[PDB]
Design a protein around this ligand. Sequence first.
Ligand SMILES: [Cu+2]
Ligand SMILES: [Cu+2]
Ligand SMILES: [Cu+2]
Ligand SMILES: [Cu+2]
Ligand SMILES: [Cu+2]
Lengths: 116, 112
Amino acid sequence: ARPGGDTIFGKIIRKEIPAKIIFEDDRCLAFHDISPQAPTHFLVIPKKHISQISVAEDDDESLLGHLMIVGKKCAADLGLNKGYRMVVNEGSDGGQSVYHVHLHVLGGRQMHWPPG
Amino acid sequence: GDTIFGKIIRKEIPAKIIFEDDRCLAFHDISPQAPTHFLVIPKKHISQISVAEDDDESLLGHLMIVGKKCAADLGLNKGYRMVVNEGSDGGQSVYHVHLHVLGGRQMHWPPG
Ligand SMILES: [Cu+2]
Ligand SMILES: [Cu+2]
Ligand SMILES: [Cu+2]
Ligand SMILES: [Cu+2]
Ligand SMILES: [Cu+2]
């Protein structure tokens, strides 16, 4: 079991498939989404493999919050001074496409309501 | 400045409360966008995620853990979407950080 698993996001964590990386630390990785839904659209993922938010453990709280802190810092570093939307998808109704926890950050245009 | 979510936290105006602890409150949105649509908000007044501090990281993660536990309790076994809006482009409606949780229908892409 290679660290991070073998979803595309685990492969990206281990530099086995390429990504456009914005920020990296010991806990997480921020990189651009290849199918962007906004002028800026990136992902913040833990390096620890968690398949989906519905199975996150209570002790994962700091790590999950760290994704949002890194997300808002990256958004500022990318000049998203008018704001942005953060999204976590869970399961089928959530539209989750990769079963490795990930925070979407979208900006550079007016986001609309409802959020899908 | 204070917001309507501060009033809800202080129990000055009603909301349909799902869950409460010493540091957050979960309640149904007054303008729901899905068959289940609730909010998880910290009791600490953080105006927007862009001004959250490093020391807030476990509190922010607590909102998500509370959110996913409430979603399971509300029967959202087919999934759901969590949303935090920042600023005007993000469509943030109240300047008190809040996590939306939406489900009970297929959520679509793009997410707004
Ligand atoms: Cu895996
Ligand atoms: Cu995704
Ligand atoms: Cu549009
Ligand atoms: Cu909002
Ligand atoms: Cu629809």
